[PDB]
Design a protein around this nucleic acid. Structure first.
Lengths: 146, 107, 203, 212, 89, 180, 50, 225, 198, 169, 119, 50, 107
RNA sequence: AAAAUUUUAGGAAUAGUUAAUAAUAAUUUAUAAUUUUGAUUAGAUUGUUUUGUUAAUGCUAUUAGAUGGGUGUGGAAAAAUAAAAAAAA
């Protein structure tokens, strides 16, 4: 499930709905515990990978001399929209904003074979006044630290 | 004639209106992100500009301009040289102004 | 604009009926004119053959005062009021007249009343609008107290040194702590005034 | 109250969108994947695509492309009026357009009637030309409309139009046309080039002598 | 707050407010009668506002004059004493 | 201007807004409740160490018997007393020069002191509100209108100045023969 | 109101500031322009008393 | 601000009105500027009980299997026209009827002419959208004789409730330019018989007897029942 | 280590595709150095680092840029005769060679200058490179090609950059233009060529 | 607000003081009398520094010509007809305030101007935006209505019922 | 009675007559057993009538009930919609956009067939 | 409706006539003598009016 | 111009500045001429839009009837000339000294 | 903006680092900066002459607050809860 999460996020970051949706369906069919309601329809059925334009079935290709002008306009518009920088970011995709990862041990835990890439647990798990009374050590140095 | 006139006018602009909005500069083909943001926004009312307090501030290579010690000193000689050697450098009203600008700012 | 004003006034006095036309053509839309122009043009208007022409000219002049931002002066308004019987041109606002009614009746009643003519110290004046008292109430006490350890007191405290003993002090600080600072618990003399008015209160 | 502080500022004065709450969360990875799959579902693109971050409705270029890439419901016109109706929707319904129809175009639409289905198409065009495009018809508009009705043989339609002419926009209905439709004067015009009181069945009835 | 009488223009909309906020011309007229009765109260309020402004602004002048006189005497005496002490030192 | 508004204490024109005279209470049972006339912001500041702008006075809403009855008894001096302390100089400062706002409860309390007229909401249930007619009002104004100079001089005395010296005082202040 | 110029001149004194000749000139000029010649002479007397 | 309601008067926080000034109260909210508005909820909402009983057709329903009888489409046209006119007429709906798109004639809203209020716009230009019911209209506003100097865009030109009274004299060809109507007194002299001014900057209408009776009955001065 | 390092594996360099791969990787490496984000970078002589490199925790702020510059210089020593081969059909275009030369020149211009005592290298390694031979090679390959400087707007920038390289690296600017322009003339300075062909 | 002075200096030092002479410059203007176009004379007051050149004086005159009718075509300065050398100092011509000097307007057009130098330019480099009047004409001491007087609404230490000490500081 | 939480209309039987309603003070109003809000509403309406303002105000119950069906946290007059987990067709299982049957939809209607037969 | 006056240009025509002269300090001695005669005449005028 | 002689409003054929100083010195300049003749090296666009011609209605009626309005765009597309042709005499009284009284086309 | 006042039985190293700068947005220059006069990290940890006690400048106690990724809106984020500070008749 960790692998599926990371790879799905990477594909979405890299603009790959086909691979992300195929991965979701594959995970749902293989029954990985986190992904058993994430099965979704395949909207690319009967489509090639490498050599065009996708049409709904109630659409017809424009005359080719005009379809060329339309595709020329569309690539230019897509790149123009992509170029503009989004403020109050750092060139960081939403999948990687607020994305700190440190291993499992960093928050009061130890090795386990099944946790291959285990982000340290949320700091909300433990409270100081829940672990020890006031003005007394809680015996968990380093916790609560990013 | 046109080039010399515009050069002297630019010298006077930077001398008499230092750091002024009319003395600002910008990178050629400068990237003004506010215009680009407005072009790609669902603007229902085309008067509420999005990302205003930042877009209005930011523009590529935008600076306030003014004359420093070296610039003023070199521009004095170049302005005096643009004139003919027979002219009186005392009565130029721009070399004198540049010299007084240097003296005032150094003081 | 004053030059055109004298021109218009001369026309009105000379009795020609073209002062209004000159005002419209030369100073209405092209100048920032006060209502003295209209104070003259109203006399010009008052000599019109038709009473309705007089009234309509007055109303149009008022509309000009509104459209071009030139308020109607009190003298102009009173001039137009003095002819309310012949031309019924209202000149006072429906709020202004109401406040006038109530305030004037109240004031005449108050003046004719005798008891309320008596002075009222609470409403008549302000006493001592200054930031500080005009006399010494004794405070502050620039000395601590036996139960007090915070000797200098810090930001808001007037106390400047510990109550009874302190570390050695030098120069003006020693002089002040020993003699000159305010000691408000003294039973023989109160804190001491500046030089010219300590002598006359010595006894 | 106002949604100025409940939704981003680029959605001010926004109305009628699918669900303006979607575009506040499209930034999540799952909703971004949904957005790209939805663009593929809509079609008209050769590469994965996401709507611009500060836009809720589709970009104007994308909507224009998808409107151009829309197959017309007819898909094969049998008659010139069907072809002309396809042309009419191509020209006066293209996308966010500006050019209004004109009475001469309406006349051309009406004079190509060969089937009563064609007349139905032409009357739909007339309704669009009177309601959507508030354009004044011409003086001969009712003439051409009556001729279109008669060449296909629907007198009740022309009679209903005469009954409701002002709402229909027929500001000028010639007296002879009105008289024919309302009973007597079984002819409605005199052919100048042929000297015959149309309809021809009525001319053969009254005028037995043809003249140039 | 703004009163919405039952008899102003109602908005026959089921996607918002059921009553508009316009008003019959009678409601326009009577509102003035209430406005005017309120304005006569505002006349005296503002009048006293400005009168108290003036009273405070004048009592300051009188008090500051006496303070200035006494404080200038204080200043002269203190400066003379300071000069004497400096001479002794 | 909050995404979710403070539903129970809404205000006008944002924070901290204009100063206002309010009659602040205490978190106590009514049996001991007393108020204090304070000047504060429209949006009560509970963040800074400075909660209020000025402390005008205190009011005790519980009547007290006249302990001073024997002293020169005057008409009805035995009626119960409602005690109040008020800072009149500071009130005049904040009311006049600062143009602060005034709540109705403090306005009614101050009208008892001769400092302000009876409030707008201190309405007698008996007399109905007036009905105004422009014609009658105009007739009254014309019947007894003041003259320009007297009106202007009353206005000047009320608002602009009140220490205008007489010719006698000007002559007294005028310097004398030696001119040194 | 014109009295406010004199009030602000007096606040300088009450705050232990030394008003300058420019302050005195400005106060006299403003009061004379407002027509308060007695207040202008009061400003002069304040200067002298200072 | 420029236009306080009662000078500086803060007695009750309602003394300033429901809008402190005509200018917008922020540079970033220009739409908040004070103006005259109209009730779009009632005006824009046409009555649908007229479209009841007729099957309209989608503009995209260009297919042949879904098209109606000629008489049915004519009834749909009539019903749609009555539906559009149900609430009132747009300035554009009147201009399309007008000879030169109305240029030269004077349009007005119903309440622009009611007691003490006299105002209308002499049309100068119309730009119809593809939907001829919408667009942009320009004109010269005339208020009690005083008129603007330049043509300005007419607000709420779309909202129904507009009126026009045609006269052949005012119509101007598209060749010509509408001349701005004169300002009474400035451009043309004042004549009481031609135009008599209803109101002016210090005039208040007399109290209607029915209104005073109603308000006294409400207040309780008069014995209602 | 750089991707150019993994390309120069002692293999048969005489492959056209390998040549473009090497050229693009070197150009990318130079661009990476030149547009490097130097916000937290600090080069202050620190005594503690005498017998060692900058601390492990201070590799990025203190060692990264210096290592990158040394790597660029060393890989240049290996790649220059491949990208800009000496003058005797050619694998690379004059435009590609000029772009690589320009980015290398920018890196040389913004080389690292401060020599710490901890460094075991030679002081001369912290000075700008000289690209006279490469500029001459590009000049041969540019004169052999016509319409190199066209009226296109970007060609103005190309002309300016080419003149800059020629002025800086002591190579006559005339070489960038056909020899017929130089025939019959004893000597034409870079400035004269600029004012003639600008 | 960086006006370049950060302390109160009540004096005027030498560098801002300038030595200048009040010259009068005559102009040939035509007035319309009942007959038509009677010739008349117009003057402009100029405060030229003693050491200025005639070209500088001409350029100054260009700047006080608020009149849209007076200095519109290229002109030259002359004394009793004898044209003046534009690079000659005033002292070398001996011109004083009692010197009749005329401005002959050659009938050219498009007089090249440079308003780049503010009318009020001293060594202190102040730039007041309004250039509607010269510094020598501005009174410079008048009530400023574009502002609001502000009272002290922040009590320092004393807030209320009893002024014990005033919590000074 | 205008407010949903001030059901003044539920206590018509709590007063005997017009004068009994108008003379009862807050204490007797509470004693008769009326909630705090209904009590205050009755008292304020009576006092407004006394001052000359009859109870003439718009019943807001239907407006507030319309606005209560949305999730405005502060019970303001906005409209905050709900975003379900699945809000797109492909996400709801619909493989691809529906295709219209052009041959079926391009057939001559029955009125057209009948009239064409008639000609 | 009306023609306004922006902060850039005096676009309504002056409402009062003003004299085009330097300040009293920039006058010559004889120029200030002319000014002195003018000012004593002004004082004669104001005293006559008083 | 109808009531005062303004200096440089009535002129000869056309201000002939050099082709290099044209866009620097010319923009912002205005002048009137007798008869309708257009400048050199310009592309003419006669405005026919009623929404644009409505704005000369008060000029067309109360000052002078306007024949035509045209926009002349430089061949380089960097400078623009709004040129308006009026017909007939002025609807305003023209003073004998007014610079517009020196125009044959007027009066 | 600044000055100034903290704790730990087993007491040592700290760093997106100091200053200069024609450098908004630092490719630069320097023998830089913090720390045994106790730093950094870790532990404890809102401050807090208001509490309590005493012959006591001792001991002792405490709840005013504040809050770099949730909308870039707004004058200002303090914005998901609101004993109510009455909020434009």
């Amino acid at each position: 499930p960790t692998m599926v999460k990371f790879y799905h996020d990477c594909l979405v970051r890299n603009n790959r709905p086909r691979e992300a949706s195929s991965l979701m369906r594959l995970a749902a069919e293989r029954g990985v515990h986190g992904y058993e309601d994430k099965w979704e329809a395949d909207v690319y059925k009967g489509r090639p990978l490498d050599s065009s334009l996708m049409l709904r079935g109630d659409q017809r290709p424009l005359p080719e001399n005009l379809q060329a002008l339309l595709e020329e306009e569309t690539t230019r518009n897509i790149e123009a929209e992509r170029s503009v920088p989004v403020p109050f970011s750092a060139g960081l995709h939403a999948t990687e904003i607020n994305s700190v990862f440190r291993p499992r041990v960093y928050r009061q835990l130890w090795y386990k074979w099944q946790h291959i890439a285990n982000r340290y647990r949320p700091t909300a798990a433990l409270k100081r006044r829940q672990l020890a009374p006031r003005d007394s050590p809680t015996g968990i140095p380093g916790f609560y630290r990013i | 004639q046109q080039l010399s006139q515009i050069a002297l006018a630019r010298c006077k602009r930077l001398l008499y209106h230092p750091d002024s909005p009319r003395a600002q500069v910008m990178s050629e083909d400068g990237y003004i992100p506010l215009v680009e943001l407005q072009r790609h926004a669902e603007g229902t009312n085309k008067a509420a500009l999005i990302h205003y307090n930042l877009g209005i501030r930011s523009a590529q290579g935008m600076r306030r301009v003014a004359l420093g010690a070296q610039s003023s000193a070199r521009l004095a000689e170049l302005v005096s040289r643009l004139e003919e050697a027979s002219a009186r450098v005392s009565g130029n009203t721009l070399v004198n102004d540049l010299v007084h600008h240097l003296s005032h700012k150094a003081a | 604009a004053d030059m055109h004003l004298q021109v218009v006034e001369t026309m009105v006095g000379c009795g020609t009926m073209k002062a209004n036309d000159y005002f419209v053509r030369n100073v209405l839309r092209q100048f920032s004119w006060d209502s003295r122009f209209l104070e003259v043009l109203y006399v010009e208007y008052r000599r019109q053959d038709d009473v309705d022409m007089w009234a309509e000219l007055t109303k149009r002049a008022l509309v000009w005062t509104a459209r071009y931002n030139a308020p109607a002066s009190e003298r102009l308004r009173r001039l137009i009021e003095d002819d309310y019987d012949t031309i019924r041109v209202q000149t006072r606002t429906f709020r202004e007249l109401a406040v006038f009614q109530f305030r004037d009746v109240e004031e005449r009643r108050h003046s004719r009343d005798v008891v309320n003519e008596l002075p009222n110290p609470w409403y008549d004046y302000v006493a001592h609008a200054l930031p500080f008292p005009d006399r010494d109430a004794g405070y502050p006490d620039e000395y601590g107290d036996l139960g007090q350890w915070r000797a200098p007191g810090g930001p808001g405290s007037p106390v400047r040194g510990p109550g009874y003993y302190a570390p050695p002090m030098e120069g003006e600080h020693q002089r002040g702590y020993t003699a000159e600072w305010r000691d408000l618990r003294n039973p023989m003399r109160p804190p001491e005034f500046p030089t010219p008015w300590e002598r006359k209160y010595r006894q | 109250a106002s949604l100025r502080y409940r939704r981003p500022y680029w959605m001010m004065f926004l109305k009628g969108v699918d669900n303006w709450k979607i575009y506040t969360v499209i930034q999540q990875p799952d909703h971004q994947r949904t957005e790209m799959l939805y663009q593929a579902w809509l079609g008209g693109l050769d590469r994965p695509y996401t709507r611009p971050k500060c836009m809720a409705n589709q970009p104007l270029w994308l909507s224009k492309k998808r409107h151009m890439l829309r197959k017309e419901r007819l898909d094969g016109p049998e008659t010139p009026l069907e072809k002309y109706v396809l042309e009419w929707h191509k020209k006066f319904h293209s996308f966010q357009g500006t050019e209004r129809p004109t009475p001469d175009d309406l006349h051309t639409a009406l004079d190509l009637v060969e089937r009563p289905l064609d007349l139905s198409y032409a009357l739909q065009l007339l309704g669009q030309c009177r309601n959507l495009n508030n354009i004044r018809f011409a003086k001969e508009t009712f003439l051409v409309f009556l001729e279109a009705c008669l060449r296909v043989g629907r007198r009740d339609c022309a009679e209903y139009a005469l009954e409701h002419a002002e709402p229909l926009g027929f500001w000028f209905i010639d007296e002879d046309h009105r008289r024919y439709l309302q009973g007597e004067q079984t002819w409605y015009k005199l052919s100048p080039l042929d000297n015959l009181y149309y309809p021809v069945e009525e001319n053969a009835k009254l005028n037995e002598g043809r003249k140039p | 707050r703004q009163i919405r009488p039952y008899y102003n223009l109602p908005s026959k909309s089921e996607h918002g407010r059921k009553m508009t906020g316009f008003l019959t011309p009678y409601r326009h007229w009577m509102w003035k009668q209430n406005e005017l009765w309120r304005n006569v109260h505002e006349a005296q309020f503002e009048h006293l506002r400005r009168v108290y402004k003036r009273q405070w602004l004048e009592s300051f002048r009188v008090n500051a004059d006496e303070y200035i006189y006494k404080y200038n005497i204080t200043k002269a005496a203190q400066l003379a004493q300071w000069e004497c002490e400096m001479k002794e030192q | 201007a909050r995404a979710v508004i403070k539903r129970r204490s809404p205000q006008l024109w944002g924070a901290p807004g204009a100063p206002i005279i309010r009659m602040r209470g205490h978190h106590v049972v009514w049996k001991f409740q007393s108020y204090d006339l304070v000047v504060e912001h429209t949006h009560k500041r509970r963040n800074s160490d400075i909660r209020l702008l000025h402390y005008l006075g205190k009011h005790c809403p519980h009547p007290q018997k006249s302990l001073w009855s024997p002293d020169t008894p005057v008409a009805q001096d035995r009626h119960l007393f409602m005690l109040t302390t008020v800072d009149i100089d500071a009130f005049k400062y904040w009311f006049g020069v600062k143009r602060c706002r005034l709540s109705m409860k403090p306005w009614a309390l101050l009208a008892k002191a001769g400092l302000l007229p009876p409030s707008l909401t201190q309405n007698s249930k008996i007399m109905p509100k007036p009905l105004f007619d422009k014609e009658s009002l105009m007739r009254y104004y014309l019947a007894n209108r003041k003259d320009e100079d007297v009106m202007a001089r009353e206005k000047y005395l009320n608002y602009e100045n009140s220490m205008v010296k007489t010719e006698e005082e000007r002559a007294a202040e005028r310097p004398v023969a030696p001119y040194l | 109101i014109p009295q406010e110029a004199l009030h602000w001149l007096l606040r300088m004194i009450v705050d232990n500031f030394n008003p300058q000749h420019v302050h005195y000139i400005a106060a006299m000029k403003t009061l004379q322009s407002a027509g308060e010649l007695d207040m202008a002479r009061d400003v002069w007397k304040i200067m002298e008393r200072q | 601000r420029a236009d306080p309601l009662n000078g500086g008067s803060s007695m009750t926080l309602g003394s300033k009105g429901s809008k402190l000034s005509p200018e917008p109260h922020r540079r970033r909210m220009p739409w908040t500027a004070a103006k005259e508005y109209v009730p779009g909820v009632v005006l824009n909402a046409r009555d649908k009980m007229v479209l009841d009983g007729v099957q309209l057709l989608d503009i995209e329903s260009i297919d042949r299997a879904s098209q109606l009888d000629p008489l049915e489409v004519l009834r749909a046209v009539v019903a749609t026209r009555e539906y559009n006119i149900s609430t009132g007429k747009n300035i554009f709906q009147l201009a399309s009827q007008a000879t030169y798109n109305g240029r030269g004639q004077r349009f007005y809203r119903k309440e622009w002419q009611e007691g003490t209020y006299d105002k209308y716009v002499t049309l100068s230009a119309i730009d119809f959208d593809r939907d001829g019911n919408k667009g942009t209209a320009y004109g010269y506003i005339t208020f009690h004789g005083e008129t603007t100097t330049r043509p300005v865009q007419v607000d709420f030109a779309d909202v129904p409730g507009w009126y026009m009274d045609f006269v052949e004299e005012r119509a101007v060809p598209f060749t010509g330019i509408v001349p701005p109507p004169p300002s009474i007194g400035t451009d043309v002299p004042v004549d009481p018989h031609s135009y008599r001014l209803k109101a002016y900057p210090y005039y208040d209408a007399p109290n209607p007897p029915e209104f005073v009776e109603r308000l006294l009955k409400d207040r309780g001065v008069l014995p209602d029942t | 280590p750089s991707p150019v390092d993994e390309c120069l594996r002692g293999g048969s360099s005489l492959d056209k595709r390998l040549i473009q791969e090497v050229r693009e990787r070197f150009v990318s490496f130079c661009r990476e150095y030149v547009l490097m984000d130097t916000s937290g970078m600090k080069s202050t002589i620190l005594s503690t680092e005498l017998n060692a490199g900058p601390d492990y925790e201070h590799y990025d702020r203190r060692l990264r840029r210096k290592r990158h510059w040394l790597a660029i210089r060393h890989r240049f020593e290996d790649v220059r005769y491949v990208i800009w081969p000496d003058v005797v059909n050619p694998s690379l275009t004059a435009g590609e060679m000029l772009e690589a030369l320009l980015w290398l020149d920018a890196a040389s211009t913004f080389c690292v200058r401060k020599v710490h005592p901890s460094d075991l290298g030679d002081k001369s390694e912290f000075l700008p490179l000289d690209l006279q031979r490469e500029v001459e090679v590009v000049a041969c390959h540019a004169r052999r090609d016509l319409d190199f400087f066209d009226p296109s707007a970007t060609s103005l920038e190309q002309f300016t950059a080419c003149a800059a390289l020629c002025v800086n690296h002591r190579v006559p600017f005339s070489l960038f233009f056909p020899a017929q322009d130089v025939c019959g003339d004893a000597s034409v300075s870079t400035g004269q060529c600029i004012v003639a062909n600008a | 607000h960086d006006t370049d002075r950060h302390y109160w200096r009540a004096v005027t030092d030498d560098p801002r003081v300038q030595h200048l002479i009040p010259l009068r410059i005559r102009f040939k203007i035509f007035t319309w009398v009942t007959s038509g176009w009677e010739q008349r004379m117009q003057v402009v007051q100029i405060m030229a520094p003693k050491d200025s050149t005639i070209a500088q004086v001409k350029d100054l005159v260009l700047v006080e010509n608020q009149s849209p009718y007076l200095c519109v075509s290229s002109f030259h300065l002359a004394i009793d007809g004898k044209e003046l050398d534009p690079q000659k100092t005033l002292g070398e011509y001996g011109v004083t305030e009692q010197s009749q000097i005329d401005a002959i307007e050659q009938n050219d057009h498009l007089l090249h101007r440079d308003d780049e130098r503010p009318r009020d330019w001293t060594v202190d480099e102040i730039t007041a935006e309004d250039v509607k009047r010269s510094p020598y004409k501005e009174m410079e001491m008048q009530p400023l209505q574009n502002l609001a007087p502000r009272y002290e609404a922040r009590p320092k230490g004393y807030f209320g019922r009893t002024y014990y000490s005033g919590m000074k500081q | 009675d205008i407010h949903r939480l001030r059901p003044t209309s539920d206590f018509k039987a709590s007063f005997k007559d017009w004068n009994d309603l108008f003379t009862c003070d807050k204490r007797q109003l509470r004693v008769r057993g009326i909630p705090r809000m209904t009590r205050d509403a009755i008292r304020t309406a009576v006092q407004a009538f006394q001052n000359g303002n009859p109870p003439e105000r718009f019943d807001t119950k239907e407006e507030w009930l319309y606005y209560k069906q949305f999730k405005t946290v502060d019970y303001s007059y906005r409209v905050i919609p709900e975003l379900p987990e699945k809000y797109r067709p492909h996400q709801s299982g619909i493989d691809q956009a529906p295709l219209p049957d052009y041959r079926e939809i391009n057939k001559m209607p029955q009125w057209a067939e009948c009239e064409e037969r008639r000609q | 409706w009306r023609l306004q006056n922006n902060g850039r240009a005096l676009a309504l025509g002056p409402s009062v006539t003003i004299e085009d002269e330097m300040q009293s300090r920039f006058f010559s001695n004889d120029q200030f003598l002319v000014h002195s005669v003018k000012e004593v005449l002004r004082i004669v005028l104001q005293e006559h009016k008083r | 111009a109808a009531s005062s002689p303004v200096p440089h409003i009535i002129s000869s054929k056309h201000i002939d500045v050099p082709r290099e100083h044209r866009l620097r010195l010319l923009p912002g300049m205005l002048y009137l001429l007798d008869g309708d003749t257009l400048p050199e090296e310009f592309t003419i666009n006669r405005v026919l839009d009623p929404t644009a011609l409505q704005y000369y209605g008060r000029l067309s009626s109360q000052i002078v009837t306007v024949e035509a309005v045209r926009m002349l765009v430089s061949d380089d597309l960097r400078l623009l000339c709004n040129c308006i042709t009026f017909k007939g005499p002025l609807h305003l009284p023209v003073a004998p000294y007014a610079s517009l009284a020196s125009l044959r086309g007027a009066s």
